[PDB]
């Protein structure tokens, strides 16, 4: 059916940058809802950002101004770019896509910032 793979990962400094991507198998990003999601240990999923199949791109407020979410038609691929990264975005990160009614998951990547002067 529809399998969905993030890459990116691993120890960055905090104040640093790093990228992620999800890659899409049976299904084009363009013609659904992408969303990207965290999970820090011990807490509830939270959302990071989203795109809609015309564009909408949408941020949470801990990340606004920092992130960047982008997709490219011809790849069948969306990315992640992390700027001016803080220990606090450390979790593991989660690629998702609505189609219709269903619903599918990647498996995650872990993203560790080291705290400010670490060292």
């Known amino acids: 059916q529809v399998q969905l793979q993030e890459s990116g990962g691993g120890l960055v400094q905090a104040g640093g940058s790093l990228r992620l991507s999800c890659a899409a198998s049976g299904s084009r990003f363009s013609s659904n809802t992408m969303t990207w999601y965290r999970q820090a240990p011990g807490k509830q999923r939270e959302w990071v950002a989203t795109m809609r199949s015309i564009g909408t791109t949408r941020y949470a407020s801990s990340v606004e101004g920092r992130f960047t979410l982008s997709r490219d038609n011809a790849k069948n691929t969306v990315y992640l770019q992390m700027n001016s990264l803080k220990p606090e975005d450390t979790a593991v990160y989660y690629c998702?896509?609505?189609?219709?009614?269903?619903?599918?998951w990647g498996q995650g990547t872990q993203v560790t910032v080291s705290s400010h002067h670490h060292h």
């Open positions: 998702n896509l609505r189609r219709g009614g269903g619903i599918y």
